[PDB]
Amino acid sequence: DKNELVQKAKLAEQAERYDDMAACMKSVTEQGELSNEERNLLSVAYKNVVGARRSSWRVVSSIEQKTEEKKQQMAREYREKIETELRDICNDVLSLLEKFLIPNAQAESKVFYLKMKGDYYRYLAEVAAGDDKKGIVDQSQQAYQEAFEISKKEMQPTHPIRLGLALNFSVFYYEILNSPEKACSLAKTAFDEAIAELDTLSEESYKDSTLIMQLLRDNLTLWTS
């Protein structure tokens, strides 16, 4: 089963049948720690599912602003109908981690889990509005904060997810909290530390470090606007 589940997952991944990946990996997670490679598949799977569920939402929202008419009914209904799909998708991954994140402490595994928990809240926060968004925004900042603490103390700057976590924390502050310096200071701190760490000898850390770090400067540059 688990082997086959991974196999169905790995094969469905090849099939890009991400819709099916969600059902397989959810059921996989339901068994309750998730191994490294096995954990990776879930993140990419739901991210791809949410991706389609987010890019569409983005274009349709723009279209609504552009729409100004009968279109307002169709657009708003459609936007709402796509929002309820992602939120159920959101509550699902949240429910899975809410249950199976607990078996985690391997500190980076716990670190990985909190990062994952914070990210989807932002997706949820984008589609929500008003007080509904406030409730999730609160949980989101707290999740990144708790993640940042353990990641900062227990994970060295060569760890790729430590850098990616800071990136997610910073993009949330910039995109919603609208405080570029609050995001820039932390993100650049990792960046400054990561470039110092570029001197490390390990090839994989080096490979993963150069791959991720490229986003940081133009991102901060884009945030100068």
């Binding site: 997610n168 993009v171 986003l215 991102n219």
Partner: protein
Amino acid sequence: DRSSSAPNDWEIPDGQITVGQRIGSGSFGTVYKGKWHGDVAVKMPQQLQAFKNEVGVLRKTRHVNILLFMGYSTKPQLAIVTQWCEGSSLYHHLHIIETKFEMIKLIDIARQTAQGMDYLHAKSIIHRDLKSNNIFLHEDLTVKISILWMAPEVIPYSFQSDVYAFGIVLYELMTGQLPPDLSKVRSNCPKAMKRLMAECLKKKRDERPLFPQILASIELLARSRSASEPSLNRA
């Protein structure tokens, strides 16, 4: 836009061109990076004779498919200036990074070399030192025109001695590995290309084809996927 996320006259007076940081060495000497209305490349009695002899051969090139020479320098030291090439040699692409070339481009790499050498040959320019360490993939694979790669009779240059080296290019293009073991040739290589590489290793030097024949041969072989109608048009 919005923030991204985690995806998972040919004499140039001295002083006009800024020669910058030293990058490396070529077949002989030192190659430096430079600036003049964009990036430029600068290559630094025996010294003067070697410079004029190499410069004089290089001085005959005026074409888009040859590493573009731009000028020469006498101050503070004798320097030969060409345009800058960004990337790595064919050897580095093929042997240290395992560069993933498209089949059409692999055939095209052969096409550009014969065109450049034919042009050079029309100007009576003997290459004498063709090899993967001397072949830079300029920008989007644009071709700009040896102990292990110098032909047995050369290692005395003639049209056929230069051709032998291009024969080795066919080997490198189809095998991709360090020596050469021809068994590494790719499975999807068109038979005509497969045979030409084998032909290039023929023992008789005078049996090698002329550059007009190679270019025409590449034009004929170059012709060597079908699918369904695309979605109709909409604004």
